[PDB]
Ligand binder design. Structure first.
Ligand SMILES: Nc1nc2c(ncn2[C@@H]2O[C@H](COP(=O)(O)OP(=O)(O)OP(=O)(O)O)[C@@H](O)[C@H]2O)c(=O)[nH]1
Ligand SMILES: Nc1nc2c(ncn2[C@@H]2O[C@H](COP(=O)(O)OP(=O)(O)O)[C@@H](O)[C@H]2O)c(=O)[nH]1
Ligand SMILES: [Mg+2]
Lengths: 62, 62, 426, 184, 427, 626, 85
């Protein structure tokens, strides 16, 4: 229950990246290109969990 | 009970034989809860406690 | 058992606090990573005062860092003994007040004071028996003066029964950094006189003068200035953290040094202070420490103690000594300089002894004097304030942020009457 | 412990405002958690015990299971907050026949069973913060012909916000209670 | 015959931290609490091979208390004896008497109660404190009043340390002293004045130590206490208990302030220098350079005097010495007391504590007298009190704590009446 | 006059940074002693020739890559220039002595081509000077920084240098023959303001590794002097990093502030699929070591593993083996010594191969034949003074600076009793009587006390306070009646036990230091600060004869053979004198004890002489007829 | 008076009931050390660590400081009459 949900965004991000010192997760920046231009949309789905484990030969035999 | 400190007794420590300073008046004291305690305490022979037990028994009986 | 909560505000406050925590960690023998590694057992028994115990044999400081710029936090985490601070005590803004008391006390305060108050209160119940608060800051800046004053107001509103130390550095016309120094200082001291239980007045000019004359150093860097102030900061509280032949409480010092509720502006010194070229030609004895301590050139304020009268004074010693030599030396200093003390308060000297001298020294002392010479510095600031105010210079950036003229008028009146009582009792 | 203590009219065994509130208590947590957080109602630090299984997570009064504290005070008072979940607490007492009775007050049972060793009782709590006073002497008198002598341990279970559990000797009113023991 | 000692404040606790090792050294008790009947007056033998003292050290700061807890005598004092509060009185009489006193004195007195019940032939009380501080003044007076309302009849030897006229280590100590004395009058029966500058001078001249600390002061105070309690502890040719002072040293219900002195304070080489006899030590026990409170008795007249002796002392020489002193005119008595001397003798000589400088003397004398030099001392303290009170300095701390200027006014007028009584009686 | 053969030696200085170093060829170790450097055969503990000539304590060592040239620097009194001394390890002679640095020389470094030396000196000097090896000349110098600089190291091509200041900076200095000047370039730290202690350079000059006092390794890419990834990922070490060494592989062996060894991988690597590199992971968590690490040296090159010699602040030299295949460090301590000045030593009665030597806070029992320390007792923070066995082997008495006398047991080191306060300050002399029931003590107050010890108690008898100065020695006669006390009033007092009185008082102009009974109790031999030994008649007290041996400085050490023919004496100088008793004749030895000798003794079996000085050194000699 | 203090008194009461301990801390053991000394006396091939053992006692409580000087040079200060204290 916070008066402003976005009331901690910048401070939390800065504390995580610098103050606490833990490595910040830097991923999903592929295909965004530069600024001032539209980002190329990837056809991948964010919500979908496309794990699809492939144990082709490491599966033990009964 | 005396070690617990629920007995309202102090020693006068007078020049004559010492009397018992009673924190509360003995008249309204609950005899049912106190008389068996002191009557059981008559048995012991240690110096600081036997005098207290005997004097308390005497005072209640009087 | 007795607990002090430290708060750092502004650039000067944060740097001085970092140096102070380095000094305290060295004195208690804990490494810059947070693990105790000392030899004597005197250190363990009084680490609850400045260090809450943490899992893994690590001790974290009981201080709250407060500012508005990322640069100060980056510098604090950069320096040595910067890894011991708890990362969640960094109450932190984004923009910076920029030498504006309005920006520090009315605009950014309205959204930072709630968070800083929550952290301070939570750290307050983190300790069982509170003793007091100590805040280290400036009186000329924006993020250190205004926000510090607002935090003091809220604290003293919530906890009306605890000691209050405000290590505040004050401007001097010779060493002048910014331009609205009188504007910030007048309002800050206006609130401090009605709010703070005592104020530790410091200034850069006196420290520079001491470093030039006594220490005979070539480049008196900010590190040296902060180290001297840090030595004072540890000396004033050594009594609670170590046993001695005459233990003195912080409230004990407050009662001995405050005869009237508003005459609570003290001036500080430290001894011994000698150059390396002369360290070998000097002994270590109470008479020489006392003469250096009472020398006017060992004082850390731009106010000559000989231009006024000592209402009260106190000396806190560290090291193995004799109370006989201590109190006879105080007798001598009171008798020879009899006219310099007030006449209607006998025994103007309080003395305390502690059994632990600081690391690197055989013996130390700390002077704290409630004299009436501070009125000179206050008049020095007030005349600048009146000169700026008669023309309303710079006043529009204060009036355009919610403020008006009445608070300035009241501050000027308050400072005038306050220096009037200093002069009257002088 | 506590056998040589003074045991005046008031005696606290756990206070939520302190450096180490849980020094004599022995936390035993499984599928749950314990915290010290600031409540949004009384603006102070209180301890939270939460657990999926109320019978698993609890805190006992004496750390050593064999070694038992000694308190002669009749009344035991808790200051808790109702989280609208299952909550229970247990106390051991000693009678003059030198046997150990047990009193367990629970939120999730209906009948009041009386056994030779355990008396299980129902409790009904109000909405927010409330103080419960237990009156060990009267409960011992009602549950058995015995009378109260001594308390051997106390243990509170999951789903509770707790602060200032203590002992007392009288039915103190709110106005006559000392300040640090009040609710506001 | 047993007497119980209680210590309040830093000064009282350290005086006790001297007296107790002196006592166990006298009785041959190792610090852990066992020997390898005379001890019964101080140490109670409990269980088997364990002796515990009859005292309570109590103070609000924990520093001195747990320094004692972790010091040399950890096993001697029972852990329940050492009471410790949380924060100082901060040289505030009101803070020490009304804020933390209401919380600590109840436990303190209900502990001394169990001490008393364990005791059987309790002779009386004796308190160790300095009125300059906050705790030893405020809560000392509070505990005094409560003990008086509890027992009342029994004697209360209060060995109180007052501030030196010109040596000072505080600021509001005149306030603390007058406020404490206002209660010390009508509750204590025998109050013994002690100073610090006088002891500094004593150890400077006689004990020829150039840099004396509090340790030597406490050691010699302990020596005085042991010398005045040796009559109960051991047997002599003429013994007196605590109750002879109560009748021979208090001629009037309110004039009870006794000055103390001790002889011979001799170092190691001066022991071989000077000849130890009775006449010269009795003479040395009377000049101003050998009394524990810095004041000049020649301005006053003696009312009563008591001489305890330890060691190889026969009544012949003390009788001759008292006769010579009475014939001497440099010291003058008062008309209301033709027989102003009370002698007492004990066979055991004083002991030597390794670590002190006092040498093994075959005999010693302790002097306790009543005079008016206390009258000038109280007048001086009253003057330096009213000087500061004229400007209402430091009164805001008291009024904030909860007191007012009322009790200040009554304390001032009560001390004025006390001086009136001294100047009337000395006539 | 003839020199005395020097048998074994125990002792080295572990406080010196990077002091203990191995010769690059063959079997040779070298470490700094008090004010001399000591060579040792790495194979067998046969002490090699010592190299004297230093005015005061040596503080830094350096060795050429070829191992032919050695450089040593010392610390001198304030105002007197410290001198760097150069030695040839093939022909052991002084080659160059250069005195330029004001107070002390911080560090020295030799070049890859063994042509230049870098000298950094002074807490206050802070001037870097470059010398040449061909002649005792100085090429060029420059002030380093406002803050003091700690260490200097060369590259493997050596026109360049790198130094790291103590407080807050780091520089790379290049040397050019065009201007004969040193051009510095400061390091580019992002924000770090760390305090550097030790530095090491790679085998190919790409990076340099410096240990901060914050407790982490710090990597600097050279030729641009840029900051890169920091040290251990698994937190920092318990105190500041104190020692660093370069494995011949791509690893760094780092020794932290609390005896902690770690092997850190040097190759960078990116983690979490980001441009940011992860911290240097520890490829091996080495076990703890008792002493604080101060020196690491790569001793041997073996295809199965790498051997390193590690010095400690507690003066404990360790040999550690590191196996890259199976990551594990194996440690064996090879020698131990005293970290601080030692004073006083004891011999068991008619028993030879036990030494009781005590230093600050430490009692140590040593074995004579093999020099291996058998037992140690440690009190946290105290200064030790006179210690002595009882005439029975039951107890070892020890004085302490706080005024307490403590008695310990020989086996298991159990304390049997202690006196809570024997003297008002430090006690200086303790002696035991033949009956083992009485003990004599003497402190700095100037009083002598006597204590009777019963099976359950310790009682104090009459105490005599004749002396006005510190009591320096106490000696009891075969029967307990007679005991002599020598103090600093210029007087020696003879006491009586049956009645605690004094018989006579021997007097001299200067302070008496040592007094020894002659066998059969015929006479007394005393030594003091008059530089004169004096014979005294034991019965009445009279000066028989005065010998002016060693008039240069004071003498405080005396012992006499069991029969009474030989008399061994110390002094304020560095030589040990061996006189005949009846005649004044010399059989002394000169080269030993870089520090002033403080005590001496002769083994009861008349085979060996043991001497202990103001530095942590025990020198086992060989006895011979005078 | 307080809960922490009461627990401390209980712990210290137990610590006074227990008999005093001569050794605060021990390394290795006396028995193993005796075997190490025995094999050393019998022959060779004994490591240094085997023979070396240390025991730590309570010792001084205060930190280590250089001793005080109580009396200065005798020619500087004197008492009222004369002498050297
Ligand atoms: N004789 C003697 N007096 C002492 C000693 N220590 C303190 N005092 C005296 O005590 C007076 C002040 O009271 P303190 O004992 O210091 O402290 P307190 O009585 O507990 O009062 P607070 O400090 O407010 O808690 C000083 O004026 C000293 O003269 C001591 O060791 N020996
Ligand atoms: N002693 C000391 N004083 C400093 C330091 N940094 C800044 N100051 C002083 O602080 C004053 C300016 O305060 P400022 O930084 O603007 O306060 P802020 O805006 O609230 O952070 C200057 O006059 C400086 O003399 C420091 O590191 N040490
Ligand atoms: Mg006090």
């Amino acid at each position: 229950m916070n008066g402003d949900v976005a009331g901690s965004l910048f401070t939390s991000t800065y504390r995580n990246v610098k103050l606490a010192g833990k490595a910040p997760p830097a991923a999903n920046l592929s295909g965004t290109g530069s600024c001032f231009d539209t980002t190329s949309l990837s056809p991948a789905r964010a919500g979908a969990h496309k794990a699809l484990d492939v144990q082709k030969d490491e599966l033990p035999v009964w | 009970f005396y070690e617990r400190g629920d007995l309202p007794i102090a020693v006068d420590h007078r020049g004559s034989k010492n009397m018992i300073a009673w924190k509360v008046d003995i008249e309204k004291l609950d005899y049912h809860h106190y008389l068996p305690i002191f009557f059981d305490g008559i048995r012991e022979t240690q110096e600081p406690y036997r005098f207290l037990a005997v004097k308390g028994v005497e005072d209640m009986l009087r | 058992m007795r607990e002090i909560v430290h708060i750092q505000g502004g650039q000067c406050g944060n740097q001085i606090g970092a140096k102070f925590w380095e000094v305290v960690s060295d004195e208690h023998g804990i490494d810059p990573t947070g693990t105790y590694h000392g030899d004597s057992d005197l250190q363990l028994e009084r680490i609850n005062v400045y260090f809450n115990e943490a899992t893994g044999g690590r001790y974290v400081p009981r201080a709250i860092l407060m500012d508005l710029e990322p640069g100060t936090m980056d510098s604090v985490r950069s320096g040595p003994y910067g890894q011991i601070f708890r990362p969640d005590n960094f109450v932190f803004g984004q923009t910076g007040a920029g030498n504006n008391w309005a920006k520090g006390h009315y605009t950014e305060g309205a959204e930072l004071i709630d968070s800083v108050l929550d952290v301070v209160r939570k750290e307050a119940e983190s300790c069982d028996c509170l003793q007091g608060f100590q805040v280290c800051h400036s009186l000329g800046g924006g993020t250190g003066s205004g926000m510090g004053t607002l935090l003091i107001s809220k604290i003293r509103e919530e906890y009306p029964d605890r000691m209050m130390l405000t290590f505040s550095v004050v401007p001097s016309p010779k060493v002048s950094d910014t331009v609205v120094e009188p504007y910030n200082a007048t309002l800050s001291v206006h609130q401090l006189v009605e709010n703070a239980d005592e104020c530790m007045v410091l200034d850069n000019e006196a420290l520079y003068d001491i470093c030039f004359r006594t220490l005979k150093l070539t480049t008196p860097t900010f590190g040296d200035l902060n180290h001297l102030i840090s030595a004072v900061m540890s000396g004033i509280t050594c009594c609670l953290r170590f046993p001695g032949q005459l233990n003195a409480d912080l409230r004990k010092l407050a009662v001995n040094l405050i005869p009237f509720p508003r005459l609570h502006f003290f001036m500080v010194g430290f001894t011994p202070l000698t150059s390396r070229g002369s360290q070998q030609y000097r002994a270590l004895t109470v008479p020489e420490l006392t003469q250096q301590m009472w020398d006017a050139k060992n004082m850390m304020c731009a106010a000559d103690p000989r231009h006024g009268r000592y209402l009260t004074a106190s000396a806190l010693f560290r090291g193995r000594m004799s109370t006989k030599e201590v109190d006879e030396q105080m007798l001598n200093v009171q008798n020879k300089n009899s006219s310099y003390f007030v006449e209607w308060i006998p025994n103007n000297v309080k003395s305390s002894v502690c059994d632990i001298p600081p690391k690197g020294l055989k013996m130390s002392a700390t002077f704290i004097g409630n004299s009436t010479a501070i009125q000179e510095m206050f008049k020095r600031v007030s005349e600048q304030f009146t000169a700026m105010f008669r023309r309303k210079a710079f006043l529009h950036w204060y009036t355009g942020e919610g403020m008006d003229e009445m608070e300035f008028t009241e501050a000027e009146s308050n400072m005038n009457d306050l220096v009037s009582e200093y002069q009257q009792y002088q | 412990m506590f056998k040589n203590a003074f045991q005046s009219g008031f005696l606290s065994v756990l206070y939520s405002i302190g450096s180490k509130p849980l020094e004599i208590w022995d936390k035993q947590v499984s599928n749950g958690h314990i915290k010290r957080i600031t409540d949004a109602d009384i603006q102070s630090s209180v301890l939270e015990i939460m657990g999926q299984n109320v019978s698993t997570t609890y805190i006992t009064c004496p750390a050593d299971p064999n070694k038992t504290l000694g308190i002669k005070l009749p009344f035991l008072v808790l200051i808790i907050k109702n989280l609208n979940k299952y909550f229970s607490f247990e106390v051991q007492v000693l009678d003059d026949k030198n046997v150990r009775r047990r009193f367990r007050a629970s939120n999730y049972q209906s009948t009041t069973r009386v056994k030779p060793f355990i008396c299980t009782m129902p409790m009904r709590l109000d909405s927010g913060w409330n103080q419960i006073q237990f009156n060990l002497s009267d409960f011992t008198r009602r549950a058995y012909g015995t009378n109260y002598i001594e308390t051997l341990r106390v243990q509170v279970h999951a789903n509770c916000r707790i602060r200032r559990i203590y002992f007392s000797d009288r039915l103190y009113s709110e106005e006559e209670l000392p300040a640090e023991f009040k609710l506001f | 015959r047993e007497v119980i000692s209680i210590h309040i404040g830093q000064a009282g606790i350290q005086v006790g931290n001297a007296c107790w090792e002196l006592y166990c050294l006298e009785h041959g008790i190792q610090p852990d609490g066992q020997m390898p009947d005379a001890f019964n007056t101080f140490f109670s033998e409990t269980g088997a091979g364990k002796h515990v003292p009859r005292c309570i050290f109590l103070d609000l700061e924990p520093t001195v208390v747990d320094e004692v807890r972790t010091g040399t005598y950890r096993q001697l004092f029972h852990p329940e004896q050492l009471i410790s509060g949380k924060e100082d009185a901060a040289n505030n009489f009101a803070r020490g008497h009304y804020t933390i006193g209401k919380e600590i004195v109840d436990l303190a007195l209900d502990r001394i109660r169990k001490l008393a019940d364990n005791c059987t032939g309790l002779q009386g009380f004796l308190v160790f404190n300095a009125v300059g501080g906050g705790t030893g003044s405020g809560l000392g007076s509070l505990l005094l009043e409560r003990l008086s309302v509890d027992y009342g009849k029994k004697s209360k030897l209060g060995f109180t340390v007052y501030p030196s006229p010109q040596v000072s280590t505080a600021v509001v100590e005149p306030y603390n002293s007058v406020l404490s004395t206002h209660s010390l009058l009508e509750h204590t029966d025998v109050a013994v004045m002690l100073d610090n500058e006088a002891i500094y001078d004593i150890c400077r001249r006689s004990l020829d130590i150039e840099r004396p600390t509090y340790t030597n002061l406490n050691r010699l105070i302990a020596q005085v206490i042991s010398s005045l309690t040796a009559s109960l502890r051991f047997d002599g040719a003429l013994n007196v208990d605590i109750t002879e002072f109560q009748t021979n040293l208090v001629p009037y219900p309110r004039i009870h302030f006794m000055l103390s002195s001790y002889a011979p304070i001799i170092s190691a080489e001066k022991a071989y220098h000077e000849q130890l006899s009775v006449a010269e030590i009795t003479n040395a026990a009377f000049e101003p350079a050998s009394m524990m409170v810095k004041c000049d008795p020649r301005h006053g007249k003696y009312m009563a005097c008591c001489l305890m002796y330890r060691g190889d002392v026969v009544p012949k020489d003390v009788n001759a010495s008292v006769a010579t002193i009475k014939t001497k005119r440099t010291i003058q008595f008062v008309d209301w007391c033709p027989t102003g001397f009370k002698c007492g003798i004990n066979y055991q000589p004083p002991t030597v504590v390794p670590g002190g400088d006092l040498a093994k003397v075959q005999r010693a004398v302790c002097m306790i007298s009543n005079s008016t030099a206390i009258g000038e001392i109280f007048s001086r303290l009253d003057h330096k009190f009213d000087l500061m009170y004229a400007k209402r300095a430091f009164v805001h701390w008291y009024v904030g704590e909860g007191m007012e200027e009322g009790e200040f006014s009554e304390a001032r007028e009560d001390l004025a009446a006390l001086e009136k009584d001294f100047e009337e009686v000395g006539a | 006059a003839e020199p005395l053969v020097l048998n074994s030696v125990i002792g080295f200085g572990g406080a010196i940074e990077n002091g203990l170093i191995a010769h690059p060829d063959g079997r040779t170790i070298i470490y700094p002693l008090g004010s001399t450097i000591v060579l040792r055969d790495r194979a067998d503990p046969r002490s090699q020739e010592f190299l004297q000539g230093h005015s005061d304590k040596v503080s830094c060592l350096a060795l050429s890559r070829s191992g032919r040239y050695l450089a040593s620097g010392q610390i001198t009194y304030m105002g007197f220039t410290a001198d760097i001394i150069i030695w040839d390890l093939e022909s052991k002679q002084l080659i160059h002595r250069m005195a330029l640095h004001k107070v002390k020389v911080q560090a020295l470094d030799f070049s890859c081509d063994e042509r230049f030396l870098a000298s950094l000196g002074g807490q206050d000097d802070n001037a870097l000077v470059l010398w040449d090896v061909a002649s005792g000349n100085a090429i060029c110098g420059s002030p380093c920084n406002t803050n003091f600089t700690n260490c200097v190291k060369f590259f493997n091509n050596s026109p360049d240098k790198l130094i790291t200041a103590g407080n807050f900076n780091m520089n790379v200095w290049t040397y050019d023959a065009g201007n004969n000047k040193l051009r510095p370039t400061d390091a580019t730290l992002g924000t770090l303001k760390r305090v550097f202690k030790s530095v090491v350079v790679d085998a190919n000059d790409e990076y340099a590794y410096c240990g901060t006092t914050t407790g982490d390794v710090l990597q600097i890419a050279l030729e641009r002097v840029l900051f890169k990834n920091t040290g251990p990922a698994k937190g920092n070490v318990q105190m500041g990093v104190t020692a660093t060494c370069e494995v011949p592989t791509g690893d760094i062996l780092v020794g932290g502030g609390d005896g902690s060894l770690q092997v850190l991988r040097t190759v960078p690597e990116p983690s979490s699929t980001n441009p940011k590199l992860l911290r240097k992971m520890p490829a091996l968590a080495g076990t703890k070591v008792e002493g604080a690490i101060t020196s690491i040296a790569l001793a041997d090159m073996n295809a199965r593993g790498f051997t390193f010699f590690v010095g400690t602040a507690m003066c404990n030299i360790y040999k550690v083996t590191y196996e890259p295949a199976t990551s594990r460090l194996k440690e064996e301590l090879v020698q131990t010594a005293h970290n601080d000045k030692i004073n006083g030593m004891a011999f068991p009665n008619e028993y030879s191969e036990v030494f009781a030597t005590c230093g600050t806070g430490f009692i140590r029992l040593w074995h004579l034949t093999t020099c291996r320390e058998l037992l140690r007792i440690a009190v946290p923070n105290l200064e030790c003074f006179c210690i002595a066995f009882t005439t029975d082997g039951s107890a070892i008495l020890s004085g302490w600076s706080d005024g307490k006398i403590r008695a310990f047991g020989p086996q298991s080191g159990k304390i049997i009793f202690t006196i809570n306060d024997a003297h008002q300050k430090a006690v200086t002399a303790i002696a035991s009587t033949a009956d083992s029931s009485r003990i004599l003590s003497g402190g700095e107050e100037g009083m002598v006390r006597v204590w009777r010890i019963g099976r359950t108690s310790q009682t104090l008898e009459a105490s005599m306070k004749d002396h006005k100065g510190p009591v320096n020695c106490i000696r009891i006669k075969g029967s307990g009646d007679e005991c002599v006390s020598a103090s600093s009033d210029g007087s020696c007092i003879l006491w009586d036990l049956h009645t605690f009185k004094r018989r006579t008082s021997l007097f001299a102009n200067t302070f008496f230091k040592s007094v020894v009974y002659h066998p059969d109790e015929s006479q007394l031999v005393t030594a003091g600060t008059d530089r004169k030994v004096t014979y005294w008649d034991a019965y009445d007290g009279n000066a028989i004869r005065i010998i002016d041996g060693s008039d240069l400085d004071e003498v405080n050490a005396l012992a006499v053979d069991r029969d009474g023919e030989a008399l061994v004496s110390g002094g304020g100088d560095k030589l040990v004198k061996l006189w005949g008793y009846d005649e004044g004749h010399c059989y002394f030895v000169g080269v030993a004890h870089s520090g002033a000798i403080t005590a001496v003794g002769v083994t009861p079996d008349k085979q060996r002489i043991v001497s202990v000085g103001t530095e942590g050194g025990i020198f086992i000699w060989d006895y011979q007829r005078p | 008076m307080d809960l922490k203090q009461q627990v401390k008194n209980y712990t210290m009461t137990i610590r006074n009931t227990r008999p005093p301990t001569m050794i605060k801390e021990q390394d290795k053991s006396e028995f193993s050390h005796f075997r190490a000394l025995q094999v050393l006396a019998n022959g060779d091939e004994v490591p240094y660590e085997a023979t070396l053992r240390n025991v730590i006692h309570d010792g001084a409580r205060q930190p280590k400081l250089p001793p005080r000087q109580t009396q200065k040079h005798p020619g500087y200060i004197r008492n009222e009459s004369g002498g050297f204290f």
